[PDB]
């Protein structure tokens, strides 16, 4: 069996075959799918390895979609795709090198290098000046000593379920997405310090939700980017979770813990420090909600994630009550109207 991803890899192969009019499914059919650009903004498992390899992707996308459109369209489009000889090749060859590698279910990577013993895409690859041996140790790089014992281990990036569920306000400051703020110089100072503390180093934010804390963080962004900041939180990236994107789409029992899990998992394990920002953190931490409180609380018990929480005087007294373990853990700043 295929991993979640792998097999959206070889439905959306087939989708493309379908979108065009080739009747059988071809190993640049899922190179194809490979390089597709996703809706929801998030990074192509492909498209990170080939520009973290310093290579052309503009160019790359270029050649596989003109060697896509080099061969023959059916007008009389059947309503069948049956796969040809080389694919075969491909998808069992996926198999015996996740067999190699002892994991548990094929994912993309072992399709990606069954991909790189098809004549095809060598070729396609060659022509698109990016080595492959040098793609190969990216992915190497990427996944390292990480095992497919699940069928959603083979993320894409590591940075995948934070792209989806959480907006990155330091790339956004970067950018020039964010007006300057103003007024707010003593409060964007003191949530710096506190996050650059040893003991206590989780901010929160207190004061009514009719006054604007979302500027404080964007304020902490732009400091983060203008190395406006003590050394330990230079390079730092300032992500906010975004609630909404975290429940869109979430319509089994279990897929919103899933999806938390796996943003929290991508910052405790990130090489370089990854700052969150929870808006509205009582929502999930307090003692009304136990659920994705049992997923946070644990999270920010091991020490490797570092949280900007954001609540009302009311509110944060509440979980106080509930949790005496919370003022150890975090550091509140009062805001008042400007």
């Not at 065009?20 to 492909?46: K, M, N, R, W």
């Not at 509205?280 to 644990?298: Q, R, S, T, V, Y």
Request: with cysteine; charged share 25%.
């Amino acid at each position: 069996q295929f991993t979640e991803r792998a097999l959206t890899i070889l439905t959306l192969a087939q989708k493309l075959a379908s979108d065009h009019q080739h009747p059988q499914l071809q190993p640049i059919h899922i190179l194809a799918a490979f390089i597709e650009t996703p809706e929801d903004g998030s990074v192509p498992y492909l498209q990170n390895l080939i520009e973290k390899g310093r290579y052309d992707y503009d160019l790359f996308k270029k050649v596989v979609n003109r060697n896509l459109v080099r061969i023959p369209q059916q007008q009389p489009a059947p309503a069948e795709i049956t796969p040809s000889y080389a694919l075969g090749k491909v998808l069992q060859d996926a198999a015996k090198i996740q067999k190699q590698q002892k994991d548990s279910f094929i994912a993309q990577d072992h399709i990606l290098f069954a991909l790189f013993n098809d004549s095809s895409i060598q070729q396609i690859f060659k022509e698109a000046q990016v080595d492959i041996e040098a793609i190969k140790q990216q992915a190497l790089e990427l996944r390292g000593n990480t095992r497919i014992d699940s069928r959603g281990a083979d993320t894409n990036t590591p940075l995948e379920y934070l792209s989806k569920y959480a907006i990155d306000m330091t790339e956004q400051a970067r950018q020039g997405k964010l007006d300057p703020v103003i007024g707010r110089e003593e409060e964007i100072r003191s949530t710096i310090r506190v996050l650059a503390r040893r003991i206590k180093s989780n901010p929160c934010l207190i004061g009514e939700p009719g006054i604007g804390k979302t500027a404080i963080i964007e304020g902490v962004a732009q400091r983060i980017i203008d190395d406006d900041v003590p050394t330990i939180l230079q390079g730092a990236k300032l992500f906010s979770l975004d609630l909404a994107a975290l429940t869109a789409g979430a319509k089994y029992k279990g897929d919103f813990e899933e999806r938390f899990k796996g943003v929290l998992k991508e910052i405790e394990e990130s090489k370089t420090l990854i700052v969150l920002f929870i808006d509205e953190i009582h929502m999930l931490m307090g003692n009304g909600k136990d659920d994705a409180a049992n997923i946070l609380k644990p999270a920010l018990s091991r020490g490797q994630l570092k949280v900007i929480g954001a609540t009302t005087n009311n509110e944060y007294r509440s979980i106080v009550e509930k949790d005496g373990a919370f003022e150890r853990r975090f550091q509140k700043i009062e805001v008042a109207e400007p």
